[PDB]
Amino acid sequence: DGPCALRELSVDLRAERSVLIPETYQANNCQGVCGWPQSDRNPRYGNHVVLLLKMQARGAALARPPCCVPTAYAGKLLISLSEERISAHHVPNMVATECGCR
Amino acid sequence: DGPCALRELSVDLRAERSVLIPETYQANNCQGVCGWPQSDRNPRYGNHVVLLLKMQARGAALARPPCCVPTAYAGKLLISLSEERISAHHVPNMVATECGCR
Amino acid sequence: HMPPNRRTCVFFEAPGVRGSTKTLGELLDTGTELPRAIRCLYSRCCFGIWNLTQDRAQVEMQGCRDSDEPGCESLHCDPSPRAHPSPGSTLFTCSCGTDFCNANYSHLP
Amino acid sequence: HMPPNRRTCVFFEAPGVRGSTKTLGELLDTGTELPRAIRCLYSRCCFGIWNLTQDRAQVEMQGCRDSDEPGCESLHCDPSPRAHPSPGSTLFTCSCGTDFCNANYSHLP
Ligand SMILES: *[C@@H]1O[C@H](CO)[C@@H](O)[C@H](O)[C@H]1NC(C)=O
Ligand SMILES: *[C@@H]1O[C@H](CO)[C@@H](O)[C@H](O)[C@H]1NC(C)=O
């Protein structure tokens, strides 16, 4: 486990019908603990999650406690098949590149 | 409960030492279920969380399953006390204004 | 032309105040005679800040709130202590939700 | 001057192909004689796409991958079926990790 950080995660696109390339790729995923004070090499917490963690530290059961989620994404050049024609197009938000607590 | 959506949440700034105004304010928080397919009035899911949910629907235990988190924030004009001087300054990321699944 | 549809507050900021809340409303023409009034853009709530010393009380800030938050439903200004900058000074703040309600308070015992 | 430090691939895109992968590398001067070569910017992996019909096989796309993903460690091109656009056509794709490895494959039984 550990603090909130970026972890490798393979995603399979052979399930997707039209995708030719890639077939599997590294999409990654954010995972870890959102401690207070923070101990992670991610950018500093936003004020909102800071106030959430400080409410929780004073004994407040948050309905949705802070979560380790991606804060930045990168695209991928997907080669897919539309009708019977091959299309190489950029698809955004395919890879998680940065993590944070929110 | 329900789907991933924005819920009211009061935050107390009287705990913070220097803050004069506000003392309590609506910071809100994102809470709900990240179903697949989505059924919420939030913007459409990003491709990353879509692929996560489709991995999970095929029987894959995600180490960090999709999470309902804020995707947009707004600031607040805080009146605080630095040294013995009063300062009115804009502080960002004080209010959650939009939700999403990541 | 017609009465104001938005909240109006007393506006004042002492020289020692850094920054301003004037961006939270529009200053009205008060006859160029003191004190200033401000019509709020984002709330129906006025606020007031007082510095309470040994025997006297100085107004530090008066103006608009940036949103309607708990405590704004008060019809009049009831200040409560918020800061202790020095052993001889206490900063009291009040918020209320009627026109010019941040002008002054009844008393602070 | 010196040997290429980056991966070089066969580059080809049939007329029926929409879009391009040329942004994934830099086209080299092949002596202005076929076929083109491309030096990859973001990976050490070449890819190849073939359309397999009744009795023939047409190369559709050849070029660079945008990243090193599982399957790229292959030293040679071993295509596997990826699409069935029509009952008489099957699209096979291979990825490999050596220079010009996407030129062709051994055989597709
Ligand atoms: C595959 O070849 C057939 C026959 O030439 C053609 O009709 C079809 O469009 C081709 N498919 C692709 C995806 O190029
Ligand atoms: C409060 O008043 C005292 C006495 O005039 C002054 O020294 C002090 O700086 C004031 N505090 C603030 C926050 O203005």
Numbering used by the authors:
A (entry chain A), B (entry chain A): 459 to 560
C (entry chain B), D (entry chain B): 16 to 124
Paper text:
Anti-Müllerian hormone (AMH) plays a crucial role in male sex differentiation and female reproductive development. AMH is a member of the transforming growth factor beta (TGF-β) family, which consists of over 30 unique, secreted ligand dimers, divided into three classes based on sequence identity and receptor utilization: TGF-βs, bone morphogenetic proteins (BMPs), and Activins. Remarkably, AMH has evolved within this family to be the only member with its own dedicated type II receptor, AMHR2. To help resolve this question, we solved the crystal structure of the mature C terminus of AMH in complex with the ECD of AMHR2.
Diffraction quality crystals of the AMH/AMHR2 complex were obtained, and the structure was solved to 2.6 Å resolution by molecular replacement. The asymmetric unit contains one AMH monomer and one AMHR2 ECD with the biological complex being generated by crystallographic symmetry, including a disulfide bond that connects the two AMH chains. AMHR2 binds to AMH using the concave surface created by the palm of the receptor, which binds to the convex knuckle surface of AMH. In addition to the central palm–ligand interface, AMHR2 wraps around fingertip 3/4 of AMH through extensions in both fingers 1 and 3 of AMHR2. First, at the center of the interface, there are several hydrophobic residues within the palm of AMHR2, including F62, I64, M76 and L106, which bind to corresponding hydrophobic residues on the knuckle region of AMH (L478, I479, L535, I537, L539, I544, and A546). Second, also centrally located, an unstructured loop within finger 1 of AMHR2 extends toward the interface and creates a short β-parallel interaction with the top of finger 4 of AMH. This positioning facilitates the formation of main-chain hydrogen bonds between residue R33 of AMHR2 and residues I544 and A546 of AMH. Here, a salt bridge is formed between AMHR2 residues D81 and E84 and AMH residue K534. Comparison shows that the receptors are shifted by about 7.5 Å, where the AMHR2 position is shifted toward finger 1/2 of the ligand, while ActRIIA and ActRIIB bind Activins and BMPs toward the top of finger 4. Overall, the structure shows a modified Activin/BMP type II receptor-binding mode, in which AMHR2 is shifted downward and wraps around fingers 3 and 4 of AMH.
